[PDB]
Amino acid sequence: MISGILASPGIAFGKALLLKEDEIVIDRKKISADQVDQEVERFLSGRAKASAQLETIKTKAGETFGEEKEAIFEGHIMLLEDEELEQEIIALIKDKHMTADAAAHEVIEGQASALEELDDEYLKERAADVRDIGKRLLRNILGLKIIDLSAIQDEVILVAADLTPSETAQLNLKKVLGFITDAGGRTSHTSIMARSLELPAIVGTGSVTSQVKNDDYLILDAVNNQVYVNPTNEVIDKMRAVQEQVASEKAELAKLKDLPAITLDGHQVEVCANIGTVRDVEGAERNGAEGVGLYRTEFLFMDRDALPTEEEQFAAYKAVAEACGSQAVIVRTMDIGGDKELPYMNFPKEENPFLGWRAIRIAMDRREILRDQLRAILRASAFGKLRIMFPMIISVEEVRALRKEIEIYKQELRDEGKAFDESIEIGVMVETPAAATIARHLAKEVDFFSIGTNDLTQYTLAVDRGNDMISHLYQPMSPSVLNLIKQVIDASHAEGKWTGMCGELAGDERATLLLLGMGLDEFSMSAISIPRIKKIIRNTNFEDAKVLAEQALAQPTTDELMTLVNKFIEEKT
Amino acid sequence: MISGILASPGIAFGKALLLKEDEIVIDRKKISADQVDQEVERFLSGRAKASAQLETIKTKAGETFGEEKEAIFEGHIMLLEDEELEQEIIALIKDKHMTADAAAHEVIEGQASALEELDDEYLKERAADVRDIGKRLLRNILGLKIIDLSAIQDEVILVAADLTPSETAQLNLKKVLGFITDAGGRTSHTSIMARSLELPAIVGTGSVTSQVKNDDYLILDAVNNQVYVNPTNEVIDKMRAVQEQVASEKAELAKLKDLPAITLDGHQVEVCANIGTVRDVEGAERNGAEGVGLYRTEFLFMDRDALPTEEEQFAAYKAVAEACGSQAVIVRTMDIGGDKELPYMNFPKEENPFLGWRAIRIAMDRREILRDQLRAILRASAFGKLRIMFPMIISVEEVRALRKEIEIYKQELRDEGKAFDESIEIGVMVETPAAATIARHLAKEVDFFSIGTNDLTQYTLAVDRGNDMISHLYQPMSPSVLNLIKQVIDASHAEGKWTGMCGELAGDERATLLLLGMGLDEFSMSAISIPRIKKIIRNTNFEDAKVLAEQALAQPTTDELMTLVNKFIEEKT
């Protein structure tokens, strides 16, 4: 009875790979004379392996990268077989009666140690490559596992206590049929990849790796949240059928286009994808997105190891605008600084990042950032329908200062003979209770709103989106957040503008009737949620939803508001 | 031209003390037979001082604490004069030709080192006392000043880069005519003491200690925010006129009259003190408080090095209730966990304490805490008018769960033959935008509200109360916070309850007309602000303020709302 958090639903069958967090222990105790001969043979026998295994890595480099990387291995291998090492390693064991792992370490460490004495950063790095050769040699004599994770020749499941971002890059996605780990939870980098990759995986197992040995055959239900170890062929069967259902689920979700999200009684809304990267446009088109409702530009910034210049941004934006064809993209200016730092910025720490120097607060304290970016967006708008939207807005002051900024950047472009869509619409995230409160005022000043309920929930309830200890209090489906949502939508409509929603509520099956009834114009979500929500929309009656929404907005209690929603679903489809 | 943040206004004249506890630099050059004689004399000459200075400390312990502490010094002094140390210290210098500071250190360190080898925690602490004797001896030979801060025999000003809470306790308030430091700002523990102590002091000097030497004569303006170093008598005299002008104000401000909170046209409000500790009742009575509007019980918890039991709390509450006489105290249940941790709880760290596991979220996850406390409050209500109020309320759910809790604790008391005021009124902090939003709903469920604008501002604007980098965005005088204030007050009144305010806005001269006009029933503040605000209240016309408030609530911009307030002050008194 083992249960984890399940980060991706699905089913899989394969062998289990174990990353032994293990470490090399040197035997420093002098060996016996009879052993001298035995230790040399162990070194030769252990060296015999690395000889053949190192050669296998070389061939992968040649085919994978080319001759430029293939010869580097020959140097490492040729250096290892250097006749000077054979005589020096054997002499210490024979002369000092030392162990092969302790004696061999001194030889490679001795040379690398001499290189470090050098006063050059270029020579020191090469000393790092030589040190690596001896480091693995110790594992090869002991037989410790060296799972560069790229050395996988057979399909296997990946099991580990936790994976660091570095491993995820040099990881074979095609040879790994899933990912299982006992890390903390979704706050783990690898956990997010399972979601985006759309592959079955667990991250809260707790202690599965201590129960699994490498080469173990395991079946992942990722549906009943159970793992079968060396099971009876019948379980391998149940699961196989569970996997069938999973596949049919895809097949069904895969389709239903018709006209964009229209209720039975004729009420239309937009339903779009939130994206991070051109690469997300694919999922959006796949899932029937009618455009992009939020282009989190941060994500593009974390797609690089340097701040992207005007030109890099422009290109990135242009690509998106174009990968979206006729469709509109709502490009949000950058939102760094709550749980989304970009390390390359080296910003200083804050006591409460989520109440700190975030998003617009940065771009306004460092105009080059705001300017490059807005410049880039505008210029990209010469290439496809783009909108500009600002994150973390708190005051009418902020909006006017930024529009004024746009207007300056617009002229500069005009003066440099650089097209931009003169029609370009500007809006604001309403994701602060401030913004929500002065929604009427803000609505005169912008073309549109998108409600960020992740943040709005966070500040309205003062519950950190990151904090699992109080997660039970994080309720975007509170009478408090809903009311503020309504109040924003209404603001929009009172000025004859519209409100969309890119917070996760838009994509939440349980809010869809309320969001709809409350008159939300636009929904934007993870692409994967587009069909569930579309389905709900297509099967509602809009008038009924209004009535629902209204009721819900009067409830002083979430439970009471959940009840309405449920009796609706019962009685209404 | 040096300027700091000025934490307390006033004027002072005195010598400057510098905490530059100079380090112990051991001279390690071996000595000569001819010197040998000189080093011994230096040791005897340096030992000659500590002999007389140590004796002076002994006499202070006897008069200050008693014979129990006086004899401990005799042991330390008697041990230092031990004939074994004289021969051993001199022998190493004469035999090993070592320095007195290096040779003497080995002798005291040698014995203390032997004591550490002991496997007992009780013997190890005594080794700490013996180690201290040799540690100061090195300073005595070098001659570096000795600054425990209790060894001050003359009045002086205290100058330091920053002071740790430990120093503030063993600090002589009567011999320190002020405090000056270059710490971060008000977020510094010592900075809060200047406010409560009501003594002139600066904490943001930036680099005054590097410009001042001990024994320097300095005059603190704390009015023009300037410091005069060795000035002419002319500056002193000007500064003496400034000092005197400060006293005149105290005199005018010390004036007190019954029914102090009534506008010209007859509108009354309560005006009370926020307190932390019975000790604050004094300031409250001093400043004309009509009761206590917020008894931050955390502060009582940080007044101790253990969690206060039901009984300790009860006693503490009883005292307050009684030190308040006829007056009502609004006892808030405990609010730990944003910028107010209590270290003794060893709670784990959070990514955003201010959006974390704070106040009520704790007492609900650990009932013993909530129970002891509510138990204690109730029982204390048998002794004076108390109200109960809850911090960090976010939902109607929370309130009902806590009332239900009260009702359980009430019965238990009934069953144990323990009086409590059956009339006891219960209310909630409205300091979350959630609470503000569902104020109508909450108003049915409680007897009253007090708006915490420090927090409300924080969450509505998502600006950390602690974060100086964005402080410019922390505006409780936003159209967004004011609107939410109005909405809360109105909720109150619609149920026939009342709203008070213990956030710092209540005490802010610039909100007083708005708070008033918006119908706030009760103001609660630092006691020191009571007269300024009373004065403003007594000199307003209430009807005019309503009109003011209304206008202000329609402004989309702070500046625009500041303008109204100003034209008012111009035209109206």
Side-chain angles (χ1 to χ4, degrees), chain A residues 289-357:
Chain A
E290 303 115 43
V292 169
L294 169 75
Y295 161 32
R296 287 184 178 86
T297 60
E298 328 79 271
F299 273 64
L300 193 251
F301 276 54
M302 306 158 133
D303 183 67
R304 301 213 184 202
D305 184 67
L307 187 166
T309 64
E310 180 179 349
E311 181 64 19
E312 290 172 347
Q313 289 184 58
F314 166 69
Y317 309 161
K318 178 179 174 62
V320 171
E322 292 176 351
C324 298
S326 68
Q327 291 172 83
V329 177
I330 304 170
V331 186
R332 193 174 70 183
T333 64
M334 115 289 185
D335 182 352
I336 273 75
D339 67 3
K340 35 180 173 63
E341 293 178 352
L342 20 42
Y344 61 77
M345 282 306 302
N346 300 317
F347 279 123
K349 303 293 186 180
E350 300 182 312
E351 291 300 311
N352 297 261
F354 266 120
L355 306 160
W357 199 38

Side-chain angles (χ1 to χ4, degrees), chain B residues 368-379:
Chain B
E368 289 81 2
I369 294 170
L370 182 60
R371 175 176 180 269
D372 288 347
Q373 181 175 30
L374 287 170
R375 283 185 67 81
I377 293 168
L378 290 168
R379 289 176 63 187

Side-chain angles (χ1 to χ4, degrees), chain A residues 352 361 397 461 464 557-558, chain B residues 352 361 397 461 464 557-558:
Chain A
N352 297 261
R361 293 174 180 172
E397 286 83 350
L461 315 184
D464 192 350
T557 302
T558 299
Chain B
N352 297 264
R361 294 173 180 172
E397 286 83 352
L461 311 179
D464 191 350
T557 300
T558 299

